[PDB]
Design a protein around this ligand. Structure first.
Ligand SMILES: [Cl-]
Ligand SMILES: [Cl-]
Ligand SMILES: [Mg+2]
Ligand SMILES: [Mg+2]
Ligand SMILES: [Mg+2]
Ligand SMILES: [Mg+2]
Ligand SMILES: [Mg+2]
Ligand SMILES: [Mg+2]
Lengths: 209, 209, 209, 209
């Protein structure tokens, strides 16, 4: 509010009590452990997919969140608009690390399911995921016949789950998996940004890009 | 390189010697001044347009920067792919402020020119720019018949030029205009990021989104 | 208040709109200018003098600020307790720069005046200030016969005044001198910390030590 | 080196991979646990004692570190110069928390031992430590008849050890105690600052003051 608010060195040096980690520290923590299943949220975790959601909002519901309940939007979103989604560097590093380990890589999303989807292909191509490590995207939710993110983590015996939202971390917590937080980019159109670290979970440094 | 690099409070509090400003401070600095021409770079200044450039690179030159010399790319980029570009909040605030002032708003881009372009329309629609304040995008460069960014600033008597690149700031400097820097987002695909403040220019706080 | 408050990347990257400068930038800004008078506040500007004020508070008024009105305290403070005051690196660099320029160096303090003082000697010795550049400490205030910081800046034609408090900056402002802010260290016992930059003034980077 | 180095938003948001904690999180982690022995380093952990070391250096060895081997210095340092040492807020909070728990509070220092010492009294008085929780300062080292910091932690069954130096953390590590790092203030005269977090240990947020 003030024109010249100023600052002080206590504020400049102030740190939130967050357990920050690096990809290297995560890899070290898994040293010796045999191949296992690991999981990733998609949106704002491995892909900056705001471009599609932004276009979707403008096209189908400029004045509300109704586009997210619109099957015409989801068809477009899941069948080509991820060509405009920008893969995150943190995800390249994590996926490379887990492939090097021989881990099974799963993607678990809350996106609404569609007749067909090319998201799995986009992910395998962009992250250079060998077919042997790759698994088709799981569309999780509370719709009839679906299973929740938590149930899927149990089902696939996923030991580590990476995600940007509170629900991603609590999904891991509910089933005894290690939930590791990725920072949502500040130019995401999905606001407010989550409070990374709100469950005392590990948060990956510099993971906004 | 070290697994546990650590830190110290000198590093935590360390500030680069940058002249940071707010939109409110810029507006205050213009108090009383009659309507004038102001200018904006487009990419990473008012639009996060990486989604289109990313798709362009993958489609036309996955292994080089050749797509930027490809007329087929520019046709797509300038005639619809900005529907996936995400308008920056800092730009909403600056444009609103300048419209409130009754200023003339110009956009000056180094994008290659095309037969037609719908970028001007995208900008007017997204930033709610009244027709009276709006001007068609200027495609500047060193191609025969073109004029440089600097020459256009002179031609239109642009008094303030906002941009994210070194060339934007030096364009303003060369003609005695006030060059004000916008931060390029860290998830931009245009790397390396510029050193904002490298010419002692004003840099807008929090302008990465 | 929350046990795990978390954070987000907007907050991590957030900058206050402050005009930060370096000693090198200040020196550059004075390139070519003939020798002139410059001035420095003492406490939390050139000396971390909290050790003496802390000891003074404990000894003379553990339950109030009364020690600051006590002549017995000021005698001790001004005649030897600065042997425990720690010279600030930013002050070493500024004083060296101004001595190199051939500038006259003044110190202007709001400390209560005493029969004798050895502060001037402490400052000349610690900052290696040549006798030709050195001037005895000015004890400024609103006591009968005293002059204010502002009046002294006028009297000595001080062109630049360095200080950590709001009153230092406004003293410079009132007389048309360039007021430049030094950050008060977060372990100072003089609290709350000032809002450096609250008058749109230049603030020296990393100047807390 | 450059006059206008600039910055970018990747650098502005960059975080070191540090396990930051708060006093509240430490207290929570000990919920339910019976009274136990805990330990604190003194210098730059609970006291900003640079004022005395600075005065000592100037008086006994202005041109070297020889003052630290001088018995005349240690007599002064350990028998009154801590009246100028400034207690750290983080230490007030930790000591209060541990006293509330009914824990035994130990101080373990590498300061050279002297005939008498009033440091224990300074600590009990300043931190309001009840006699029942207080223990005389342990002077640890590798001098004949002394025991090392590590040996003392073992001897007193100290379960948590707080300190600012690498040697403090490794002392705890060597005996299976929980070593928790405090940040050394940037205006300390003991340089270089340690790399807090260099052993993957917990580091207390904002603990420089
Ligand atoms: Cl960012
Ligand atoms: Cl600090
Ligand atoms: Mg997500
Ligand atoms: Mg970003
Ligand atoms: Mg640009
Ligand atoms: Mg002061
Ligand atoms: Mg220590
Ligand atoms: Mg400090």
């Amino acid at each position: 509010s003030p024109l010249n608010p100023g600052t002080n060195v206590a504020r400049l040096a102030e740190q939130a009590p967050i357990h920050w980690v690096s990809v290297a520290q995560i890899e070290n923590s898994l040293a010796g452990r045999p191949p296992m299943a690991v999981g990733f949220d998609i949106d704002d975790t491995v892909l900056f997919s705001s471009p599609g959601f932004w276009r979707g909002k403008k096209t189908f519901s400029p004045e509300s969140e109704d586009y997210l309940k619109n099957p015409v939007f989801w068809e477009k979103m899941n069948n080509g608009w991820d060509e405009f989604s920008i893969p995150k560097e943190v995800a390249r590093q994590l996926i490379d690390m887990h492939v090097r380990r021989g881990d099974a890589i799963f993607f678990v999303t809350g996106r609404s399911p569609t007749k067909t989807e090319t998201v799995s292909k986009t992910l395998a191509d962009n992250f250079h995921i060998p077919a042997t490590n790759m698994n088709p995207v799981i569309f999780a939710g509370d719709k009839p016949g679906q299973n929740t993110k938590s149930q899927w983590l149990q089902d696939k015996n996923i030991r580590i789950f990476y995600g940007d939202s509170d629900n991603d971390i609590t999904a891991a917590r509910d089933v005894g998996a290690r939930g590791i937080r990725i920072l949502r980019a500040s130019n995401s159109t999905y606001k407010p940004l989550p409070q990374a670290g709100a469950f005392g979970e590990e948060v990956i440094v510099n993971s906004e890009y």
